Design a protein around this ligand. Sequence first.
Ligand SMILES: CC1=CCCC(C)(C)[C@H]1/C=C/C(C)=C/C=C/C(C)=C/C=C/C=C(C)/C=C/C=C(C)/C=C/C1=C(C)CCCC1(C)C
Lengths: 187, 173
Amino acid sequence: VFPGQFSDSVPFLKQPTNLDGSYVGDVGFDPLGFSDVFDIRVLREAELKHGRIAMLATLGMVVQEAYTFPFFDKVLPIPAHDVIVKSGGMSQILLWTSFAEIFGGIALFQTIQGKRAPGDYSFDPLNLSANDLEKRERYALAEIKHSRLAMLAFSGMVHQYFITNQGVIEQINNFRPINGFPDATFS
Amino acid sequence: LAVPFLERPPMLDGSYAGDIGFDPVGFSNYFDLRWLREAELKHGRVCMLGVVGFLVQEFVTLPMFSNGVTPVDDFFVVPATGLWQIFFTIGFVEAFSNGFKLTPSDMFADDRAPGDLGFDPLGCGKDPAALARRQLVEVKNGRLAMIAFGGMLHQQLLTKQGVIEQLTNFKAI
Ligand SMILES: CC1=CCCC(C)(C)[C@H]1/C=C/C(C)=C/C=C/C(C)=C/C=C/C=C(C)/C=C/C=C(C)/C=C/C1=C(C)CCCC1(C)C
């Protein structure tokens, strides 16, 4: 309300020092100043890695309840974590993702040197936005928005299962309030 | 370039066969590239003969020895004596072919080609373009055969079945 320069997202906080706006998805939202303590490139790579993992996590949390493979067994994903820990396949997932992150770490260390864009592994086999440059930043904005939405969504689904003990598809069709609150007294 | 999101390694110019700039962990630096090339060729050749040995030992057994359940267990059913004869014969071959130079320091004293032990009895490697093509073929086949050997040894250890026997009798663990 009072005159002064502030961030586009939060109107009572100023624009952060290291959020100039060159990176996609930047609405000037850094209240605690994480970009002032650590580099924006490392933070962007961490954000993209978390967001992509969360995208695949939300897709899995939907599909595993929607359709389970003929092998393994029909079980909810959260205890399926323990089931596949005891089965041995999750250790192999860990090994292969570690093998990918071995090269990912070298990519990150070259990102600090400023030789590659943060989160840019140059993986476009379908050339969906490789030849065209105007589509590239639009797809980057879409990817980062989907990344944040997927992180929020996976956290929501997990914490809904933790108190509801129902599947995500089960909860949107058999919606029950927690703790027996429909007919609860002195809660 | 094999790894597009990383730079080309500084020591991989492309002189050797099969060089596509694949060294993210950077063993090309801080080491001798000739040593690594000879090690790669030696591992490739050893696994390249080992895959054929694993294929042969399923159906063909020498009359002196008794065949085991797997070619992996063929190592145990043969006596301990005779095994060390193979060990010492390989030692003698690797001593005479390398010119009795066996360390990263004294090897490549004459700056010979890495992996070139002077063993061309049939004289196939005469045309230099064909020589380069056969270098590429040998290196890529070794890179395939080392992975193949590492796979088939563990498959025979885990399933207690031969590789062709496993492919004809595929089953879960
Ligand atoms: C880098 C790369 C290229 C493109 C594909 C891809 C993206 C997947 C990527 C990944 C490649 C990968 C995962 C390669 C994996 C290589 C691996 C795991 C190799 C391991 C090999 C293991 C081997 C030999 C074991 C040899 C053991 C031997 C002899 C002897 C065994 C025994 C005998 C019988 C005698 C007594 C002693 C003992 C131990 C009992």
